[PDB]
Write a structure and sequence with these properties.
Blueprint lengths: L2 E8 L6 H17 L5 E8 L3 E5 L1 H7 L2 H4 L12 H12 L11 E8 L16 E7 L6 H6 L8 H4 E4 L3 H10 L6
Parallel strand pairs: 1-2, 1-4, 4-5, 5-6
Antiparallel strand pairs: 2-3
Helix pairs in contact: 1-7
The protein binds the ligand CNC(=O)[C@H](Cc1ccc2ccccc2c1)N1CCC(=O)N(Cc2cnc3ccccc3c2)[C@@H](CC(C)C)C1=O and magnesium ion.
PDB class: immune system
Keywords: I-domain, Integrin, immune system
Assembly: monomeric
């Protein structure tokens, strides 16, 4: 069947330029692996505020990850994850922007920190949510457990903690045959 998948990617001030580029390259690798499938993609950068970098209609038009992410500018602010998830649920999964009514809705969140805001994500209850937390901010179990509230359940299946940004490519290499769900 059809999957509408959104990447919600951290553009916070804690990321070095090299680290931000590794997030971009990962999204590109995933999209390239799934080209010519029934997946459709959108990407949203989040920091203090939220920007749709490309929507589903854009993807269908260009089908070129490198082209679609060429103009991305690193926001360099905070990490308002609650607001970001709500923004995706209400502003991105919209028929007008190319979302398909019949499709399974999936959100992949990539982040290097705890949320600096609060709230709820009731609006996103129907979206399958997979979270990748990267780096030293998730060294402790307590910080890791803050991500469980954004993820689908059970957390053991929907939260992945990576110690370095190099692990994005390593895990892609290791597990790429599993991506075509
Ligand atoms: C059955 N497939 C999986 O479990 C893979 C495993 C995987 C493979 C590559 C990875 C690369 C970096 C970090 C983590 C990775 C994890 N898996 C995890 C589970 C998941 O929910 N999704 C999201 C997803 C993707 N497509 C779906 C289609 C239908 C229903 C639910 C769906 C859920 C993806 C996430 C991955 C691309 C980071 C995934 O392939
Ligand atoms: Mg950060």
């Amino acid at each position: 069947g059809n999957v509408d998948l959104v990447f919600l990617f951290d553009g916070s001030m804690s990321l070095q330029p090299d680290e931000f580029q590794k997030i971009l390259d990962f999204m590109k690798d995933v999209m390239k692996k799934l080209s010519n499938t029934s997946y459709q993609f959108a990407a949203v950068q989040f920091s203090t505020s939220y920007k749709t970098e490309f929507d589903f209609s854009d993807y269908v038009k260009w089908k070129d990850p490198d082209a679609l992410l060429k103009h991305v500018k690193h926001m360099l602010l905070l990490t308002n994850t609650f607001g970001a998830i709500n923004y995706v649920a209400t502003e991105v999964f919209r028929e007008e922007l190319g979302a398909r009514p019949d499709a399974t809705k999936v959100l992949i969140i990539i982040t290097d920190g705890e949320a600096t805001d609060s709230g709820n994500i009731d609006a996103a209850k129907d979206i399958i949510r997979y979270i990748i937390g990267i780096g030293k901010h998730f060294q402790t179990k307590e910080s890791q457990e803050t991500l469980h509230k954004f993820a689908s359940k059970p957390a053991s299946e929907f939260v992945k903690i990576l110690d370095t940004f190099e692990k994005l490519k390593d895990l892609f290499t290791e597990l790429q045959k599993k991506i075509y769900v």
